[PDB]
Amino acid sequence: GSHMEQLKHCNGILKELLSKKHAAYAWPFYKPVDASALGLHDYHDIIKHPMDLSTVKRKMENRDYRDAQEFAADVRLMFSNCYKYNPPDHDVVAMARKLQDVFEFRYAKMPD
Prior knowledge:
It is found in: Nucleus; Chromosome. By secondary structure, the chain is an all-alpha fold. The chain has helices spanning 4-17, 23-26, 35-38, 43-46, 53-61, 68-85, 91-107.
């Protein structure tokens, strides 16, 4: 799905995820996890491929993604990293699930 149209749909989703409408639970994913600042000294030993929305945005602007699948993989990687590092009961996981629901349902409306 290397269609320009599908990438526009992906960019729309990206814009929504970064919008005020979802800010209450999307904020933890706005920037790369600063492990040191947060005292998470084992973060990079556990998470081999960090990902966040600012990185996805940069890759989209630089036309790094060639198709929708690539984009989706990074967004899901971001959520997976959260589920892998954090205990299931952590508040950040609750926020990840909510933002992922927003993503999955709109990604499912992908024109094709």
